Amino acid sequence: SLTINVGLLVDETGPTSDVGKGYSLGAELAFKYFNEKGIYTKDGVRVNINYIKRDYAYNPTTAEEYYREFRDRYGVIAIIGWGTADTEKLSDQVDTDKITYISASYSAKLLVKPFNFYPAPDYSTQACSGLAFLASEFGQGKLALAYDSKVAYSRSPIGAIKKAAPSLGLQVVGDYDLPLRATEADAERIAREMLAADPDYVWCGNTISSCSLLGRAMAKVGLDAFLLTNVWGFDERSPQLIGEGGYGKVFGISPFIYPMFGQDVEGIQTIFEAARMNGVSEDQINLRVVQGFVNVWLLIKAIESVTSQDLQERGGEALKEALEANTFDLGGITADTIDYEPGFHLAYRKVFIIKLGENGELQLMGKFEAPSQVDCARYTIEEG
């Protein structure tokens, strides 16, 4: 009875497609799932989502071209987006255009942008939560930071990590330039550079490809430090990508429960049903699929929170206001429920921590959160 247009901006072929492919699959699964099950406004009008998928391959020029297409050709009222650089670049424009923007980027810089949302803590709060886990579990010690200095995503929480680090009992010993498109040689060079400083802990801010190469290299060159990665740097593939050398010594952050730890989680079972209905094999359902699915689901919950009159008249603005006026639960997938403040869209703070176990199998550590007094988010926002 009502159809809305929604953009889906993904990286299926570029330098972040290691994690981007799964996200795209999960987002599409969610669109098809909720469309078929039935999406209803508060006054009971059915909503159909016509989604327009565009693989921009992490290319910032292409991102802006597809944005203009979404807006001008399709008149979308919402976009399910991707990269930190492009999401940040577009944030002021999406406010002007009144398009609700839900991103795979969890940049803290988005928190003050009125139309940007994501169902996770920002990257900095996530990072500081993971580092607090390290400090409390293994003690105070030396910390090296490995990230691509040229990539907005790789840089995002670095400033906040440096500011928060002393209060966490962590001494930052250096920054190390690991490319987003790191080769094995790049990873070994960085591991050998860090070895000279002998850190107890290593942070990596890149996607799973370079994070895993680094973990593997660290073990190969004899740097026996723990590796902690951001959410996009670690998943179900990590045991195989890092190898036996990293067993017992690598940790991943995730705001979302993995399917393998979520047999009894409603939202995980919702994804599994979506998979069955769309001919997707169960073994293709992973964390990346969850990350895509939950972004679409957050949009669905917003639509279910508005009247059809509101949706028709104010479009993306009706969706923004609904996201600000309600607490959301996505079938218990997220580490905490979702609640957004006008002017500060911080969904929640805590995260799950996952260990690459001694036996090579992934192990859930539990939920962890940075100290209450550490304003990780605002540290990053105030940068510059």
Q: How far is the CB of 352 from Mg ion (least distance, A)?
A: 23
The CA distance from 8 to 72, in Å, is 15
Q: Is position 324 annotated in a ligand binding site? A: yes
Order of strands across the sheet that contains 170-177: 170-177, 141-147, 201-204, 226-229, 250-254, 351-356, 362-368
Angle at 342 between CA 341 and CA 348, to 5 degrees: 20
Between residues 263 and 327, which has the closer beta carbon with respect to Mg ion? 327
Q: How far is the CB of 145 from Mg ion (least distance, A)?
A: 33
**Residue 256 found at the interface with Mg ion (CB under 5 A):** no
Q: How far is CA 84 from the centre of its chain?
A: 10
Segment contacting Mg ion by CB under 5 A, of 98-106, 130-138, 318-326, 328-336: 318-326
Q: How far is CA 374 from the centre of its chain?
A: 21
Q: 5 has which bridge partners? A: 50
Q: Is position 321 annotated in a ligand binding site? A: no
Q: How far is the CB of 26 from Mg ion (least distance, A)?
A: 25
Segment contacting Mg ion by CB under 5 A, of 44-52, 175-183, 192-200, 317-325: 317-325
Q: How far is the CB of 112 from Mg ion (least distance, A)?
A: 15
With a CB cutoff of 8 Å and minimum separation 6, the contacts of 122 are 106, 107, 108, 110, 111, 157, 346, 376, 377, 380
Measure Cα distances from 281 to 36, 98, 272, 295 in Å: 19, 37, 9, 21
Between residues 122 and 188, which has the closer beta carbon with respect to Mg ion? 122
Provide the token pair at 196.
């000279």
Alpha-carbon dihedral angle through residues 117, 123, 126, 131, given to the nearest 10 degrees? -170
The CA distance from 249 to 215, in Å, is 9
Segment contacting Mg ion by CB under 5 A, of 47-55, 113-121, 268-276, 321-329: 321-329
Q: How far is the CB of 338 from Mg ion (least distance, A)?
A: 9
Q: Quick one: which H or E segment has residue 143? A: strand 141-147
Q: How far is the CB of 301 from Mg ion (least distance, A)?
A: 12
Between residues 234 and 340, which has the closer beta carbon with respect to Mg ion? 340
Q: Quick one: which H or E segment has residue 79? A: strand 78-81
Q: Is position 200 annotated in a ligand binding site? A: no
Segment contacting Mg ion by CB under 5 A, of 32-40, 87-95, 195-203, 335-343: 335-343
Residue 5's Cβ-side half-sphere holds a number of Cα atoms within 13 Å equal to 13
Q: How far is the CB of 116 from Mg ion (least distance, A)?
A: 14
Between residues 17 and 305, which has the closer beta carbon with respect to Mg ion? 305
Segment contacting Mg ion by CB under 5 A, of 38-46, 73-81, 158-166, 338-346: 338-346
Q: How far is CA 55 from the centre of its chain?
A: 18
Binding test (CB under 5 A) with Mg ion, winner from 147, 232, 340, 379:
340
Between residues 317 and 339, which has the closer beta carbon with respect to Mg ion? 339
Interacting residue ranges for Mg ion, rule: CB under 5 A: 324, 339-340
